[PDB]
Design a protein around this nucleic acid. Structure first.
Ligand SMILES: [Zn+2]
Ligand SMILES: [Zn+2]
Ligand SMILES: [Zn+2]
Lengths: 187, 293, 78, 102, 190
RNA sequence: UGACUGCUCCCUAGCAUGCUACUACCG
RNA sequence: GCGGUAGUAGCAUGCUAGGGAGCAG
């Protein structure tokens, strides 16, 4: 704390008294010098701690306000944060069935109900283009979620039944394409 | 909370307590906002006011930062340092601040009633973001001085397109044409009820029907307005002409019925923004289709 | 380490599903809660994975909900 | 007395509230959790002491993160006066020695 | 802190004493200066301390009385709210059936569990599944508590209207099953 | 929508006591 | 020459009050 007038006064008094004492002198001069020195020393010493307490208190207050602002900010982005985190962990898991269904949904082939686990029960998906049908459906079997399923019904956007033999490269582009395959889980 | 004061290029958490849009001003920037004019009240993450029960101090120039709180002048526990001191106001970003050379931007145009031509004059003598602040404040003043007039209502109904109309308590009436759509709401006992869109010009009160209506008792018509949110993208894009016609899907045929289209087609080929000054019949009828084809 | 990962992923997935107002359908919410509670009690890491597939199918079969493609282009899921 | 390590780890990893998935906002949670988990360092099994050591290292990391993360964008400079006591075992060893305090 | 009653005397004595010191007079005037200034500061000390104690005492008293006033206001508003709630719930007692069953009592006292059982106008039934449904509220009118009730509405766990034509054995697994049935007392109260 | 107890850690404000220090009065 | 008294500053100790958090039945 060397930026206060009290420090300047105390330093000048210290220098004057020290020089006078080192020069050598009587008792009355020493007494007068110390009576004029100690008041300035106390004046300096009070502020020397008051300033420190003020500075640390200000630092703590700024810390607390930063923490409050950050918490208020954080509690307002939870949906996006959670979605990003979930997909990061889904990457890190690295499973074949999960990767299969995520890529299928990313290209457009999403399911319509909860995927069953038993050797029975119906599953319905939507196939929006011929390329997805070429990749997944070949023959009369269906490969989805790293499993095997058996096609039993095909329905178009007009809800008319389409037989499996109908679908072909050039024979397809005269149809309502968002097909709906309903299959059951092969053993 | 944490926004942006940009003239001083300073992230801020402060804002002027009594102003147009709760504008964001940094420490020194809030300071010369509160000494060049009279705005002796600010808002931070928390508002600055003495926290003892029953105390009341609007001013900030004499508050102190006490024990994780704020205290004041008339009711003074002064074991603290003053909030407003040393050319700055206490807050975050108290060190990473620049200041403003043009001291009186807000002090000039945010201090008048937002109706003189000087507002628009300075708005055109601004930067892109400063003029964005200007435009948003013009929308704000439009709405805030539109919400100072009456609400029309039909209490006993007559034949459609010729009704009776009483208005409000003491307020004046705005201009008369269909500029202000009288689309209010109806109240059954506490709630708001389907009303429709109306407009009052002729008054015996003749109405124009944006829809066909069966008006009931008390039906109130007035424009109830929200406030336009701040925008995050610039208005105009800087002028940069293209290197080539790279990235275009060219065609083979050339428009013939339009006799001033081919050179302008090439212009769109290497022009980034395009404005012209024309009455009806300036390509607005056919040139858009010309580009479309 | 392959089991705690799937339990944490299941917790995050249930949180995401709850954020999308799924508990406004009692049957779907009951099924999701049953699956989530069954995953956390698993002992072997095959039943947990099939239940995880079943639970993720609920989120995938909601058209508007989220953007699978944007959330896959942010240096995220492949 | 010592608790079940799984309980301490579960309290560390699963929270109610969203604001408790940011350790810098609440460092006093982990101090209490490490107080509860101190006597695990005398257990003959080895992971049990590793729980307490992991908590101490996480506390130190959180403090360093706070100080640097606050010195960077703002310009407030933090001090490490009588804060290192929270990542040394002597502050926690004194809670199980018979001498009433506070 | 600057216009205290003793401030004038203290400052005037200090100024006069220091002027005498600056006059370069003998040591007796210096001793008198020292004594007078010492006693002046000593008397200023308590005048500067007691006032500061009193101001803080007064401030504490003001704060306490303000909080007392706020507590009284809150008490008044909670009293008004409770009175309003009681007088509002009073207006649905059906004061003819209640009077009819009160007068039959031999001293005016009746169990509380039989008041809704004999005077209520509406009945609500919660049904777990279809097997329980077909044994309790089958059809359009059923009998319960020695009275006849007729159905008025049926909703599901999601609070959506359900028609009785689709509550069947085949269509049972397609409903949010905690069904709620609402009926009215027939021939009696509503 | 958030019960009754017990224990412990952290921060601030006040009170009481003690230690040291600086001036001043008195004998 | 020693002690007493009156303010002022720093430090320590125990309670009361307020706030944040942890564990147990
Ligand atoms: Zn302002
Ligand atoms: Zn600024
Ligand atoms: Zn005050």
């Amino acid at each position: 704390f060397s930026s206060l007038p009290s420090y300047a006064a105390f330093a000048t008094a210290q220098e004057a008294y020290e020089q006078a004492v080192a020069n050598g002198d009587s008792e009355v001069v020493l007494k007068k010098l110390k009576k004029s020195l100690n008041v300035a020393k106390s004046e300096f010493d009070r502020d020397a701690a008051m300033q420190r307490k003020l500075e640390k208190m200000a630092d703590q207050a700024m810390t607390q306000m930063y923490k409050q602002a950050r918490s208020e900010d954080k509690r307002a982005k939870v949906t996006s944060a959670m979605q990003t985190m979930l997909f990061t962990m889904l990457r890190k898991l690295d499973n074949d069935a999960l990767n299969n269904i995520i890529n299928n949904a990313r290209d457009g082939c999403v399911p319509l109900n909860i995927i069953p686990l038993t050797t029975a029960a119906k599953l319905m998906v939507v196939i929006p283009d011929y390329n997805t049908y070429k990749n997944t459906c070949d023959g009369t079997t269906f490969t989805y979620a790293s499993a095997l399923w058996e096609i039993q019904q095909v329905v178009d956007a007009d809800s008319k039944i389409v037989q499996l033999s109908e679908i072909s490269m050039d024979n397809s582009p005269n149809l309502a394409w968002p097909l709906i395959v309903t299959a059951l889980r092969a053993n | 909370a944490v926004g942006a004061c940009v003239l001083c290029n300073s992230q801020t958490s402060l804002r002027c307590g009594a102003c147009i849009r709760r504008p964001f001003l940094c420490c020194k920037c809030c300071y010369d906002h509160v000494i060049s004019t009279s705005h002796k009240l600010v808002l931070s993450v928390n508002p600055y006011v003495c926290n003892a029960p029953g105390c009341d101090v609007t001013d900030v120039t004499q508050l102190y930062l006490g024990g994780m709180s704020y205290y004041c002048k008339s009711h003074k526990p002064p074991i603290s340092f003053p909030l407003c001191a040393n050319g700055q106001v206490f807050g975050l970003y108290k060190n990473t601040c620049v200041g403003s050379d043009n001291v009186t931007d807000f002090n000039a145009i945010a201090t008048c009633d937002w109706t003189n031509a000087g507002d628009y004059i300075l708005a055109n003598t601004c930067t892109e973001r400063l003029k964005l602040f200007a435009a948003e404040t013009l929308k704000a003043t439009e709405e805030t001085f539109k919400l100072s007039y009456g609400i029309a209502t039909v209490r006993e109904v007559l034949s459609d397109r010729e009704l009776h109309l009483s208005w409000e308590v003491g307020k004046p009436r705005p201009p008369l044409n269909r500029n202000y759509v009288f689309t209010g709401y109806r109240v059954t006992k506490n709630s708001k009820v389907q009303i429709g869109e109306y407009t009052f010009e002729k008054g015996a009160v003749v109405y124009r029907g944006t829809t066909t209506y069966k008006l009931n008792v008390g039906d109130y018509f007035v424009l109830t307005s929200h406030t336009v949110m701040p925008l995050s993208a610039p208005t105009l894009v800087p002028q940069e002409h293209y290197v080539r016609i790279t990235g275009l899907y060219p065609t083979l045929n050339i428009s013939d019925e339009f006799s001033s289209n081919v050179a302008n087609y090439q212009k769109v080929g290497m022009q980034k923004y395009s404005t012209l000054q024309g009455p009806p019949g300036t390509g607005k009828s056919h040139f858009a289709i010309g580009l479309a084809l | 380490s392959k089991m705690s990962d799937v339990k944490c992923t299941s917790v995050v997935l249930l949180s995401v599903l709850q954020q999308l107002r799924v508990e406004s359908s009692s049957k779907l919410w009951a099924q999701c809660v049953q699956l989530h509670n069954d995953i956390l009690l698993a002992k072997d890491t095959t039943e947990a994975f099939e239940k995880m597939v079943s639970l993720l199918s609920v989120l995938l079969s909601m058209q508007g909900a989220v953007d699978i493609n944007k959330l896959c282009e942010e240096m995220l899921d492949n | 007395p010592y608790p079940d390590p799984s309980r301490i780890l579960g309290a560390g990893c699963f929270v109610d509230d969203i604001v408790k998935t940011d350790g810098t906002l609440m460092i006093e949670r982990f101090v209490s959790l490490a107080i509860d988990a101190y006597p695990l360092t005398k257990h003959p099994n080895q992971e049990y002491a590793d729980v307490f050591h992991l908590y101490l290292q996480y506390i130190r990391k959180l403090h360093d993160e706070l100080t640097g993360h606050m010195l960077d964008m703002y310009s407030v400079m933090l001090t490490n006066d009588n804060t290192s006591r929270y990542w040394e075992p002597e502050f926690y060893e004194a809670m199980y020695t018979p001498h009433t305090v506070l």
